[PDB]
Amino acid sequence: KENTGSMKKPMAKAYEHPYNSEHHPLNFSAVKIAETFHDFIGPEQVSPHYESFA
Amino acid sequence: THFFNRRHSSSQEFIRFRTYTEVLLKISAYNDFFYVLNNYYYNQKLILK
Amino acid sequence: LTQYVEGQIVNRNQLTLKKQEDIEQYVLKLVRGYFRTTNKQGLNINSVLQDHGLDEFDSIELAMQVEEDLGYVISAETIPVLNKVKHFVNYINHVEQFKAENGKAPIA
Amino acid sequence: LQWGSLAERPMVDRVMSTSTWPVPYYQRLFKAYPIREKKDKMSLLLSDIDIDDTNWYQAKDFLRGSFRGRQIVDYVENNIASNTYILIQQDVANMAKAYVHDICGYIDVANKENVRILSKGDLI
Amino acid sequence: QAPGNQDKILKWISTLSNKATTGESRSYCTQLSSLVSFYNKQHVEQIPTIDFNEWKSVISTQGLVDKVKENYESLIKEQYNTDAISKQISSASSKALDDIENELSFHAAIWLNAYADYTMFLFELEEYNDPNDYLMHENFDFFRGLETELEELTETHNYIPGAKDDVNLRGYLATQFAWGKKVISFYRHPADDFKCAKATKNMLGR
Amino acid sequence: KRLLEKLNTLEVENILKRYHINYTQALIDELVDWKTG
Amino acid sequence: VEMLKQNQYTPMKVEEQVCIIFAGVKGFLDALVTSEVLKFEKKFLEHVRTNHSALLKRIRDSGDLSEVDTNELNTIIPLFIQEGGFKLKA
Amino acid sequence: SRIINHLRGDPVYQDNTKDVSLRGTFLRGKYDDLPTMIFFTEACDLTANWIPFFTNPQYDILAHRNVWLLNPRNFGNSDRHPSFDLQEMSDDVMRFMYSQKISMATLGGHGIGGKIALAVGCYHAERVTGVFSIDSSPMDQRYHEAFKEFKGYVNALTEINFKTWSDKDVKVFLKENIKDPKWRSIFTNNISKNAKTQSDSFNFEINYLNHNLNFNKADSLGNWAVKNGIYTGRAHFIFPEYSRWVHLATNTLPMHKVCARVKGFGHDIFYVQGDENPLNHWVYDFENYANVVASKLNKFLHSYDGVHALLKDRTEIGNFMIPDRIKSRNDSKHIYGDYSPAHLHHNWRFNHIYEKHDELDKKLN
Amino acid sequence: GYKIRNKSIFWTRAGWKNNWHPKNFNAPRPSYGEFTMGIRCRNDHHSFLRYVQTYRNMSRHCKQYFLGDKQLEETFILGLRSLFLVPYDSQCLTDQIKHGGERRFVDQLDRDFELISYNTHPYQLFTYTVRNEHLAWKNEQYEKIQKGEKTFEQELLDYLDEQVLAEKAKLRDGQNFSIERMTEIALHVFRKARAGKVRPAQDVRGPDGNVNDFLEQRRPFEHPNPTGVTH
Ligand SMILES: CCCCCCCCCCCCCCCCCC(=O)OC[C@H](COP(=O)([O-])OCC(O)COP(=O)([O-])OC[C@@H](COC(=O)CCCCCCCCCCCCCCCCC)OC(=O)CCCCCCCCCCCCCCCCC)OC(=O)CCCCCCCCCCCCCCCCC
Numbered sequence A: 001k002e003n004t005g006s007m008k009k010p011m012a013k014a015y016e017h018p019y020n021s022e023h024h025p026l027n028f029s030a031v032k033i034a035e036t037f038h039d040f041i042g043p044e045q046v047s048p049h050y051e052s053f054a
Numbered sequence B: 001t002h003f004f005n006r007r008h009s010s011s012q013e014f015i016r017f018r019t020y021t022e023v024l025l026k027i028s029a030y031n032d033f034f035y036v037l038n039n040y041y042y043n044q045k046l047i048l049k
Numbered sequence C: 001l002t003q004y005v006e007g008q009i010v011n012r013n014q015l016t017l018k019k020q021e022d023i024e025q026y027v028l029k030l031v032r033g034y035f036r037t038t039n040k041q042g043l044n045i046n047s048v049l050q051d052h053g054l055d056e057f058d059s060i061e062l063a064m065q066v067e068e069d070l071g072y073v074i075s076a077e078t079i080p081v082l083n084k085v086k087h088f089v090n091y092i093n094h095v096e097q098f099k100a101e102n103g104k105a106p107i108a
Numbered sequence D: 001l002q003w004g005s006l007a008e009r010p011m012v013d014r015v016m017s018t019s020t021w022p023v024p025y026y027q028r029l030f031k032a033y034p035i036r037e038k039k040d041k042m043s044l045l046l047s048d049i050d051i052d053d054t055n056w057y058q059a060k061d062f063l064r065g066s067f068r069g070r071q072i073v074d075y076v077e078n079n080i081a082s083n084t085y086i087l088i089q090q091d092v093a094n095m096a097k098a099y100v101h102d103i104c105g106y107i108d109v110a111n112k113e114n115v116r117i118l119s120k121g122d123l124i
Numbered sequence E: 001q002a003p004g005n006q007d008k009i010l011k012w013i014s015t016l017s018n019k020a021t022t023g024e025s026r027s028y029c030t031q032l033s034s035l036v037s038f039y040n041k042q043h044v045e046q047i048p049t050i051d052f053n054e055w056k057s058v059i060s061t062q063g064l065v066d067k068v069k070e071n072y073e074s075l076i077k078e079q080y081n082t083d084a085i086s087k088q089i090s091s092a093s094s095k096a097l098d099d100i101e102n103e104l105s106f107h108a109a110i111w112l113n114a115y116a117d118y119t120m121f122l123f124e125l126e127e128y129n130d131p132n133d134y135l136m137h138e139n140f141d142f143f144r145g146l147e148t149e150l151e152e153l154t155e156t157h158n159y160i161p162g163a164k165d166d167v168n169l170r171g172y173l174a175t176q177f178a179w180g181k182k183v184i185s186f187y188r189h190p191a192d193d194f195k196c197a198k199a200t201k202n203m204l205g206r
Numbered sequence F: 001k002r003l004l005e006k007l008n009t010l011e012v013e014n015i016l017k018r019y020h021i022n023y024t025q026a027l028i029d030e031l032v033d034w035k036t037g
Numbered sequence G: 001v002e003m004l005k006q007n008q009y010t011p012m013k014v015e016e017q018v019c020i021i022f023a024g025v026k027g028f029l030d031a032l033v034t035s036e037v038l039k040f041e042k043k044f045l046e047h048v049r050t051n052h053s054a055l056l057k058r059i060r061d062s063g064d065l066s067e068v069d070t071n072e073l074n075t076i077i078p079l080f081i082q083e084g085g086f087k088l089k090a
Numbered sequence H: 001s002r003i004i005n006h007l008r009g010d011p012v013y014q015d016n017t018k019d020v021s022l023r024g025t026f027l028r029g030k031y032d033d034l035p036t037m038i039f040f041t042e043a044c045d046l047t048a049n050w051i052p053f054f055t056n057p058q059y060d061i062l063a064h065r066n067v068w069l070l071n072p073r074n075f076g077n078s079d080r081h082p083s084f085d086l087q088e089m090s091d092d093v094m095r096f097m098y099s100q101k102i103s104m105a106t107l108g109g110h111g112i113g114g115k116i117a118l119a120v121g122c123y124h125a126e127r128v129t130g131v132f133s134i135d136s137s138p139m140d141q142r143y144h145e146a147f148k149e150f151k152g153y154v155n156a157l158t159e160i161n162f163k164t165w166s167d168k169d170v171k172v173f174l175k176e177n178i179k180d181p182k183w184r185s186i187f188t189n190n191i192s193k194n195a196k197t198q199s200d201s202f203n204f205e206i207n208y209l210n211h212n213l214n215f216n217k218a219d220s221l222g223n224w225a226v227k228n229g230i231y232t233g234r235a236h237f238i239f240p241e242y243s244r245w246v247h248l249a250t251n252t253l254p255m256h257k258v259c260a261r262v263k264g265f266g267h268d269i270f271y272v273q274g275d276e277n278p279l280n281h282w283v284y285d286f287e288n289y290a291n292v293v294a295s296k297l298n299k300f301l302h303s304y305d306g307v308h309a310l311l312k313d314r315t316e317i318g319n320f321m322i323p324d325r326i327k328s329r330n331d332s333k334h335i336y337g338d339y340s341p342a343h344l345h346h347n348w349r350f351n352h353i354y355e356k357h358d359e360l361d362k363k364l365n
Numbered sequence I: 001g002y003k004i005r006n007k008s009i010f011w012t013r014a015g016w017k018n019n020w021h022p023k024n025f026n027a028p029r030p031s032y033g034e035f036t037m038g039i040r041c042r043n044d045h046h047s048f049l050r051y052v053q054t055y056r057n058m059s060r061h062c063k064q065y066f067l068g069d070k071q072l073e074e075t076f077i078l079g080l081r082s083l084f085l086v087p088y089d090s091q092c093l094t095d096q097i098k099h100g101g102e103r104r105f106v107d108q109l110d111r112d113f114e115l116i117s118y119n120t121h122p123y124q125l126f127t128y129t130v131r132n133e134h135l136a137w138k139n140e141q142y143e144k145i146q147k148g149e150k151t152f153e154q155e156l157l158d159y160l161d162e163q164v165l166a167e168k169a170k171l172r173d174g175q176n177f178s179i180e181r182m183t184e185i186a187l188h189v190f191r192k193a194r195a196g197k198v199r200p201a202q203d204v205r206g207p208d209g210n211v212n213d214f215l216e217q218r219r220p221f222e223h224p225n226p227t228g229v230t231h
């Protein structure tokens, strides 16, 4: 009997806010500023060498 | 402060109550493994014993 | 007068009871429709909503649904006294009597 | 579809590396996170939360996905006198009642058979 | 049959009784135990064999010893029909049993859902290592929902740290040696002002 | 109590201690009997 | 003392006495009230004859109280006292 | 039976330090193919005591790796040789790995065992994936009070003569001369009676050991020489908060001094929260200490052990690219760029997994 | 692992763990009618009804953007109650707060509703994103089922049901297939399936069963390291 089960059709989509995006988030937090900051200073500059440059 | 308290302030002698975000994530953000585990427990114990 | 239902726009219908037997049936159908209600068949006219898993915040959601089905405008001062099925039945009658005598809806 | 060997673990856990001299001096400060994508992973906030309403609401959702589960839901939400869906068993009163009311009902079954066998004929 | 066939049945009743705490539960457990012992009572009396020939020879009324034998044997053939009873008890059990068969199922499904929550957390936690070596926005992505909560505090100008946290442990750690050791009051907003003022017969509102 | 305090001042025994499991004297006897038997 | 008491014209079987006398020395009778010990004797013996019939047979035929009977008997005596309706308060 | 398999042999006194063979217990893992872990117990301490730690379902360490509870030379059942040079004792492990067909292994140790484990990574790093040291540090401990007691007890044990001394004479000697309960129990269980009850003796070479400790010079086990060098690979250190062997104040610096990749406290160095108790050295006895050691061990084995230095965790395998040094490759027509370093199979030398998968890859194409 | 050692961590000048009435110099003092001429105070007895209407608004104004999704309306209610039940279930004695916790919380919920009336509250935008990702995954299952194809979720359930049969057919000495045993079997499959997503199963080897994938790799010519230098 369990194998005979079926699945209902779900909704196509929920509400899409016309003024919120992943790159331009509507509301503010220090989390998004952190993403923009580490994109500016770039990722950790990993050295492949055995001694420091200086 | 928000990051530390929401991850280290809970204790066993008190009840931690679910927040709004924790309700939406459990019910409307569960992954495939979670869906499989529940039905896996249900079929084996509640149906097939 | 239209609302979304599972993503589809559907025309909303309003009810006019004007009869005691129709009110008791509507409230039970209403209370039994709420996903928080326990012992739906054990629910009767003299059932305390507290005994069925309902608190003050659930009575609001029920009153909010009464406004949708009947078109009433229920004030915040009246909601916190609706804690039994008998209360919804008597409040619905008091509103129908008020509009039948005073010709207007009660103060919201 | 292909599943591999149940015993074997992913090759990542088996694949190893070793060090040698000379060594790079640089000590990694942070983990690289170039792309902000953490999909298909559940939140770690859902760690030590006690039983609440979300447990019985999500249970019905999964039970309603099965035929036997749909019967449990309909019967529980209609034919169980409980003031809450957060069911907690701390006593076996309701469990023993249902057993004595059932195992006892099947009494007199043998005495009934004796009536037929003994009423068949008279020894004399 | 006689030996060892009831050992397992004793463990089930023992655990069932140990879980009973209320006196009412203890009473029904005693009733249940009696029914089990009643059904499980062993009958061993060494059913003796009848030698009708011996009685037929020593002394008996003509036609009696033979009539008893033929009639006795007829009833010995009759026996219980275990097959019929085995089927009825397996198909349908009872009404009250169905009530708890469906209650305990939903009960277990509630706590299996919680067992899965705890299990899947420890499963996701394997990918989390060195919280102190993750970037700020990567840690918040593991704990999805903290950014949303942090936005709500900012948009409502609840920029006093730990105001909406019932246990502001971070505030206690920062005030272990503070003058006038205190933590912010619960749900305190930086804009609320409950100051009052009165005029009395005396000066300065005294 | 006084005389006891004054007087105060095996393979199965060691193996069980390794697992830090509290062992009664009765259990030790059965295991020894189980081996010999 | 309350256990050894016996009515008139009421002889007891040897095997039945062993069970009752056993429960007394072991101290199980200390739980229920003394006034309920005499009636407990009757109820206990009747309960044994019906459910525990193989136990009585071994004690009768062999005439010895084996260890298996002790464990079974030692386990039902505290159990029965809790089952029957008695005054458990000593 | 199956999970517990300890090869059986007799110790052999060896004149050549290269003809030394190590013997110990092997704990099989739950899964078919898993990397191997070689763990060295404290000096004069039994390997069996660590079995319940590595065979506990709550910890589930065998789910990660197969464990070799191995005895160093002059200890337990392994061969005997007067020298304790960590370079020689390290070569012993390399021969064991060869005889047992182990390409590379994870190394662990308790106390002095941790030194022996770390020494192997210092002398043979290309074949060691990581080191996990418990209540030890690459440091000179000759003058630590805890070591002196151990050094003192071993000297007292040289006074007993099993031939003349009776069983009771021994028990009285230990209680009075050995105050520490654990050391006392450890030494008692190390006493064994040879076949034919010829006489009783210690499983470890008491003569060779006492000379090493009593002399108290560079070759002593308490000492850590500059000759041992630097360990280039992954290293994690775990020790009690109040430990007589590793003091949090200054005994953590040797880790940075000897281990190049050690980041520091909280990343590769942890202390277990505990009280002052001289028995805290034996973490496997107390559940509180053990539960923390196990969790940290499983984390090291799962995410950090056998991972390239410049990679944070095992998660970065296949998604993090390491910068390349110019003129580092033989190919001249090579465009230098970032690359993900190669992580090989744990026993790729003694199997043909690469030859097999190469064939399967061709079938795809 | 690590416990706070300071016993006086939760001490305040107002008592232990007191975050409802911190000690301050200008403390509340009573008022006497016979001696009071005038007073300026904002406290009133309107917080109860404001607590009721605020709920009705935050609920009704959020449902405007749920598109009749009944499962979302019921989920949102559970989340809305968790926000209103904070004063009733917290360790903080909300009835002893300095100048009235009732007015404090009501005024706080009003600030949340204002953002809700504009559909700019982070809980709303978080619910939309979470729900859309959920429906995209549910619709993917529906499209695969209408084609008679098997879902990745059903393949696991069937693979786990058969593994249980294999493990219990050898478990004859005991007969307690605990929930612990059922779990480790599923997790072992999950870890292999989890690693399979990034490295799919090409051959009988299975998901993530190729050693060659872990040999030295290089960025493709068409996608170099955009953020930093390579050498
Ligand atoms: C027409 C011809 C004219 C042009 C000709 C062309 C010439 C052009 C010149 C270019 C030269 C080549 C450039 C190479 C890179 C830059 C130089 C460098 O050293 O980088 C490597 C150096 C470290 O080398 P590394 O081995 O790769 O790092 C390993 C570890 O990660 C590092 O951290 P660690 O702790 O893990 O390891 C040890 C660490 C330990 O030492 C340190 O870490 C140093 C600690 C400093 C940080 C402390 C906090 C202070 C910084 C706060 C930030 C304030 C500035 C920003 C705020 C305002 C916004 C502008 O490093 C050391 O070993 C010792 C430090 C190096 C020796 C001392 C150098 C001192 C001067 C460098 C800074 C310049 C100061 C301003 C001078 C200019 C005046 C206008 O990087 C830095 O520390 C900072 C670099 C910033 C330099 C900016 C100036 C560039 C001009 C260079 C000219 C030479 C200096 C002239 C000043 C003379 C004053 C005495």
Ligand SMILES: CCCCCCCCCCCCCCCCCC(=O)OC[C@H](COP(=O)([O-])OCC[N+](C)(C)C)OC(=O)CCCCCCCCCCCCCCCCC
Residues within 6 Å of the ligand: E178, E179, E180, E181, I013, I025
């Ligand atoms: C450089 C960046 C900018 C920095 C900006 C300023 C940073 C301020 C840092 C925070 C400290 C602020 C000091 C507040 C006093 C805290 C101590 C205290 O409460 O007293 C308790 C004290 C200490 O109690 P205690 O018990 O906590 O400590 C006792 C100390 N021992 C142990 C040594 C005995 O007790 C009292 O009750 C005294 C009450 C009088 C306090 C005097 C307060 C005067 C300041 C208030 C007016 C300021 C408003 C300015 C508004 C300007 C508007 C334009």
